Design a protein around this ligand. Structure first.
Ligand SMILES: O=P(O)(Oc1cccc(Br)c1)c1ccccc1
Ligand SMILES: [Ca+2]
Length: 517
């Protein structure tokens, strides 16, 4: 009996959003998995979506894997490249049926789809985002660049779909298709099921009957929400009782300065966001419940994670996502209070709502601070001894591929594969740790880097240096002790210059080992 694998990925979901991670959002199915399983407080991705995915499915750094930056902002090919082999390719050759429904974000062309990169069945959104209901604006030269880059471009296997079924809603469709593939499976061989949702990613959109469950829940605003989330994190033991939260940084007006109408719309956005997450969770339950009734769940290793920190961006602030985003939305969408959440609305919830969900951490998605890279994760697999607990052991998304190969009885092919030279995993298997033999998969000497959009981080043990350029940081290296300062508040660069210079060496090594530009 070799295990099945179920890897579920939420898109821009925040660290404390779900119930068992401190949240008020209804997530009964993930909560059952998390309390019985092991929850992780020091698990890491990249600061953004496609880089994190490139890493999940190869076991090495996104700069090696082809996503050195996002395609949309151009191993810098803009897709998963031929210098790496992908987990599903490896498992498919060892007898696993490879199944996916969800967001891909690792290439748009035939030779780059899931069906080209190791999946026997796949239903995928290829770009980084799209309208959850398939409602499309007009496309021409003049359409905002951010909209031109996010059409509802789906594929099933090799067939690019020219229409979507009626009632299409992204999370419900991904639940539907993965269930179909599981029910159609060969019941006497194991599976690798990959369930990358595009929820709760903008535009924020969800069925009204779920949104209505949160009516008025967010009327006290995002600081009030942050205070609730931090109290609950502490109460549950997810964060140390006296942790100092990083201060909230935003260029928008604070809740109390806002006019009544603006508040009503901003709260309605966060109501919609909550319904996205509950509705995601509902589709996760349909899949998990089917596996359970089949007698398969207990020999399934289940991993759930978000792909980056919660999304604080103001899409109207990046004129390269335009020209004229807001004017185009005014003319083509209906963002009135009543309509927010339907197919022809288009909103994002902004920096303050997002910081409520990353607290105590500094900032959010697209930064190299812990706000952008520390994400919620859980593992439910009852053959592991380390279950029912909360672990603060350091771990990354690069650890997953090695772990699953290990569990599957499969050797990584080393440096050549299908007659091409290839990269070897930078992560470490979780099996010694999760099987209870060791306290963690890494130690006080483990070195890890990040670099993206001109920001840097370098970590060794619990020591981390960060580099944020202008206008979002001081354009210099800052040094943090994450054992004492999870908020990355107290810069130690002057009190501990030897430690920093050491980390700076490690950074140069990372640049040269990974090909960072
Ligand atoms: O994965 P994505 O959500 O990532 C980012 C990263 C930095 C800033 C922003 Br805004 C979105 C994204 C979605 C669609 C097109 C381009 C990028
Ligand atoms: Ca994402």
């Amino acid at each position: 009996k070799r295990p099945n694998f179920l890897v579920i990925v939420a898109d821009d979901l925040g660290f404390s959003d779900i119930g068992t991670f401190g949240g008020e959002i209804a997530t009964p199915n993930l909560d059952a998995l998390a309390i019985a399983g092991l929850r992780l407080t020091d698990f890491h991705t990249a600061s953004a979506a496609s880089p994190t995915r490139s890493m999940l499915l190869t076991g090495t750094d996104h700069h090696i894997a082809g996503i050195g930056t996002m395609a949309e902002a151009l191993g810098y090919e803009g897709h998963l490249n031929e210098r790496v082999v992908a987990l599903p390719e490896l498992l498919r050759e060892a007898g696993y049926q490879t199944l996916m429904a969800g967001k891909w974000h690792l290439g748009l062309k035939p030779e780059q789809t899931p069906h080209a990169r190791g999946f026997e069945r796949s239903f995928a959104l290829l770009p980084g985002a799209a309208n959850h209901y398939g409602f499309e604006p007009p496309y021409d030269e003049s359409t905002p660049r951010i909209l031109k880059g996010t059409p509802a471009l789906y594929v099933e296997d090799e067939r690019y779909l020219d229409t979507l079924p009626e009632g299409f809603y992204s999370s419900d469709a991904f639940g539907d298709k993965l269930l179909q593939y599981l029910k159609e499976r060969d019941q006497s061989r194991p599976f690798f099921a990959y369930l990358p949702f595009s929820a709760p990613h903008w535009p924020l959109q969800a069925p009204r009957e779920i949104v209505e469950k949160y009516r008025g829940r967010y009327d006290a605003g995002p600081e009030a929400l942050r205070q609730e989330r931090l109290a609950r994190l502490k109460e549950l033991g997810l964060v140390e009782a006296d942790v100092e939260a990083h201060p909230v940084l935003a260029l928008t007006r604070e809740w109390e300065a806002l006019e009544d109408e603006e508040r009503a719309k901003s709260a309605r956005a966060m109501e919609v966001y909550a319904a996205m997450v509950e509705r995601m969770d509902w589709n996760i339950g349909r899949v998990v419940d089917y596996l359970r009734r089949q007698g398969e769940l207990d020999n399934t290793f289940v991993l759930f994670m978000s792909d980056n920190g919660a999304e604080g961006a103001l899409l109207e602030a990046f004129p390269k996502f335009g020209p004229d985003l807001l004017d185009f939305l005014d003319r083509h969408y209906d963002n009135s209070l009543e309509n927010i959440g339907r197919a022809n609305s288009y909103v994002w919830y902004g920096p303050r709502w997002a910081q409520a969900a990353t607290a105590p951490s500094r900032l959010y998605k697209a930064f190299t601070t812990q706000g952008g890279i520390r994400v919620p994760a859980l593992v439910r697999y009852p053959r592991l001894s380390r279950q029912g607990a909360i672990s603060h052991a350091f771990a990354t998304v690069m650890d997953v591929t090695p772990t699953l190969l290990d569990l599957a009885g499969v050797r990584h092919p080393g440096k050549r594969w299908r007659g091409r030279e290839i990269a070897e995993p930078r992560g470490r298997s979780w099996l010694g740790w999760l099987s209870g033999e060791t306290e963690a998969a890494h130690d006080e000497n483990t070195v890890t880097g990040w670099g993206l959009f001109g920001m840097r981080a370098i970590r060794q043990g619990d020591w981390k240096a960060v580099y944020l350029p202008a206008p979002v940081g001081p354009a210099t290296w800052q040094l943090y002790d994450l054992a004492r300062d999870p908020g990355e508040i107290h810069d130690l660069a002057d009190s501990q210059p030897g430690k920093l210079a050491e980390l700076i060496e490690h950074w140069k090594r990372y640049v040269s080992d990974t090909g960072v530009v």
